[PDB]
mmCIF file of C-alpha atoms and ligand atoms in Angstrom:
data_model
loop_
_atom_site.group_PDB
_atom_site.id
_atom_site.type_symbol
_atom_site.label_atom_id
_atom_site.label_comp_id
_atom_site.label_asym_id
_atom_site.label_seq_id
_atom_site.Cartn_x
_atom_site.Cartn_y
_atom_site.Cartn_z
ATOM 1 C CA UNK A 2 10.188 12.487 -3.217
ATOM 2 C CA UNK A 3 8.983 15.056 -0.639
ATOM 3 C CA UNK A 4 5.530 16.037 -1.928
ATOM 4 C CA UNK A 5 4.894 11.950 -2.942
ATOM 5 C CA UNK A 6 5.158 10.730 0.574
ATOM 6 C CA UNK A 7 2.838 13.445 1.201
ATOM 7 C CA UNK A 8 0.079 12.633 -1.160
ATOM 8 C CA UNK A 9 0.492 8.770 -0.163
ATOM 9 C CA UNK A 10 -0.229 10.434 3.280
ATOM 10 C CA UNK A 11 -3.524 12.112 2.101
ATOM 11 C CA UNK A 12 -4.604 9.109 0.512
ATOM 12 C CA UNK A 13 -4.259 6.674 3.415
ATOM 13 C CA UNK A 14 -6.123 9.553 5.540
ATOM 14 C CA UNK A 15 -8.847 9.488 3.696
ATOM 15 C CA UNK A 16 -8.882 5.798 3.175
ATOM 16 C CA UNK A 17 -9.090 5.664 6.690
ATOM 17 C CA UNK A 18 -11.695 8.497 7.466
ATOM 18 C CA UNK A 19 -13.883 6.918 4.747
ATOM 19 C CA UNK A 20 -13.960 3.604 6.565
ATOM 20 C CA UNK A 21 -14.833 5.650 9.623
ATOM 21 C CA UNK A 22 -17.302 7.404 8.093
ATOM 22 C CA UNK A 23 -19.252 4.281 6.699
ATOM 23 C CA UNK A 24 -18.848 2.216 9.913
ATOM 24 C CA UNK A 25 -20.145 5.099 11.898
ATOM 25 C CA UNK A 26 -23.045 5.419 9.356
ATOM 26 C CA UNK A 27 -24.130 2.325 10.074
ATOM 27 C CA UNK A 28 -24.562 2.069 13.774
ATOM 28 C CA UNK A 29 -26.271 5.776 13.285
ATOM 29 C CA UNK A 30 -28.484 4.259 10.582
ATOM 30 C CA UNK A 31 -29.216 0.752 12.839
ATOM 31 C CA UNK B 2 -27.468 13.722 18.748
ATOM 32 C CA UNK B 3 -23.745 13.405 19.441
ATOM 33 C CA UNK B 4 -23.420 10.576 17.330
ATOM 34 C CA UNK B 5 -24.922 12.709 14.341
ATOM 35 C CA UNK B 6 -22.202 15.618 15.495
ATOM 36 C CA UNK B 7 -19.271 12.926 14.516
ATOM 37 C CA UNK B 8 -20.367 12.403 11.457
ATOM 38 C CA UNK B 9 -21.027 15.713 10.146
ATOM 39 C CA UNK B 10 -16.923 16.298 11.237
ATOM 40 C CA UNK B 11 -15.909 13.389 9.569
ATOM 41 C CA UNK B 12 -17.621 14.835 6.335
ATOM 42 C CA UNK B 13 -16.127 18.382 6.841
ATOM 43 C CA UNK B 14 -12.340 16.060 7.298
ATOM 44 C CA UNK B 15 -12.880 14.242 4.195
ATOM 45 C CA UNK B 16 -14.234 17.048 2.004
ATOM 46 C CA UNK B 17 -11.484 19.179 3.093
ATOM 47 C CA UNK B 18 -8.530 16.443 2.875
ATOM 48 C CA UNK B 19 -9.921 15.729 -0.595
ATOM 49 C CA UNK B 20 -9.482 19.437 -1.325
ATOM 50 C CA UNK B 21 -5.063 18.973 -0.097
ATOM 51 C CA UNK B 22 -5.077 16.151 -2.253
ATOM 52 C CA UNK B 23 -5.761 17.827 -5.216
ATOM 53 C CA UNK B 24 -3.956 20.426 -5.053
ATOM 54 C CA UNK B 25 -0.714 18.365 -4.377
ATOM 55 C CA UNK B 26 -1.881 16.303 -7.243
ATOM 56 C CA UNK B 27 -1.504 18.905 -9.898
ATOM 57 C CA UNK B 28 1.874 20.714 -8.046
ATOM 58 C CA UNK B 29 3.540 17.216 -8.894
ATOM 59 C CA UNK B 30 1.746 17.307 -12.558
ATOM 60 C CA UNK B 31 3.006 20.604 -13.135
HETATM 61 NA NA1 LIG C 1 -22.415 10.373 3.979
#
């Protein structure tokens, strides 16, 4: 229902902000 | 730097996604 499509919602957020966070780690880190 | 700025955002996104995630987590568990 309603509230599912919002949790898959949260979790592909922070799938994608994790990625994010680790590739930008890595150029700050050399 | 600006770089380090980013990242510190992305953590404050994450943490605080992780936080809407939970809580929708245990409104569908009941
Ligand atoms: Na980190």
């Amino acid at each position: 229902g309603q509230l599912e499509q919002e949790l898959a919602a949260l979790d592909q957020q922070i799938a994608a902000l994790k990625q994010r966070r680790a590739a930008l780690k890595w150029q700050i880190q050399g």
